Amino acid sequence: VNSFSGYLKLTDNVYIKNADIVEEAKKVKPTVVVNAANVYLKHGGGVAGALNKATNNAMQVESDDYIATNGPLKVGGSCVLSGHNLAKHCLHVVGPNVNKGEDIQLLKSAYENFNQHEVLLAPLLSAGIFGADPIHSLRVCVDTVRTNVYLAVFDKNLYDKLVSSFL
Numbered sequence: 001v002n003s004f005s006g007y008l009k010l011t012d013n014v015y016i017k018n019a020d021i022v023e024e025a026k027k028v029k030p031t032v033v034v035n036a037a038n039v040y041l042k043h044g045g046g047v048a049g050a051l052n053k054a055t056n057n058a059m060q061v062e063s064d065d066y067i068a069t070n071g072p073l074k075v076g077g078s079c080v081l082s083g084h085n086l087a088k089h090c091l092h093v094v095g096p097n098v099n100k101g102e103d104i105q106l107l108k109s110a111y112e113n114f115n116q117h118e119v120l121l122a123p124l125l126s127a128g129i130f131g132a133d134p135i136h137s138l139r140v141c142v143d144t145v146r147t148n149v150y151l152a153v154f155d156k157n158l159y160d161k162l163v164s165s166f167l
């Protein structure tokens with residue numbers, strides 16, 4: 001048993017809810033929250049900007065030190081950093097950004113990072129401002145992630161559509 005509440009079960013291991021991932025992280029304090037990161041760990045907008053703002057910019061300070069030491073992530077890659085006040089850990093995962101022209105086939109590689117963690121609170125990768133089709137992102141998630149994932153969908157109207165179209 002875990003502390004996640006009000007989720008619709010989609011599969012054996014994937015759950016979904018209409019929720020603000022920041023508010024959800026603050027309530028649950030999960031072991032792992034996933035960030036919709038870019039390769040520079042520049043947390044400006046979407047889930048990254050919102051998560052970073054909730055940490056009072058401590059996420060960005062830690063991220064800048066990580067990049068200064070290690071250089072940029074790969075598209076499809078990830079790193080584990082602190083969860084600050086939101087979670088034990090933050091898994092920063094880089095899905096492909098369609099609005100920058102990145103290969104959508106890298107979305108499966110991005111979701112494979114989730115399999116290194118038994119339970120995660122996450123957004124849909126490559127969705128929203130990343131420019132990919134969220135229905136596609138949910139399908140790749142269900143077909144790739146084998147660990148237990150609690151998906152927070154921010155947009156109410158998109159959520160109504162993801163549930164009603166899910167196969």
Ligand SMILES: O=C(O)CCc1nc2ccccc2[nH]c1=O
Nearest residue numbers: 123124127128152153154155158
């Ligand atoms: O809802 C999410 O969690 C996915 C990212 C996202 N997609 C949208 C699509 C259309 C309109 C608003 C949107 N807001 C969003 O946050």
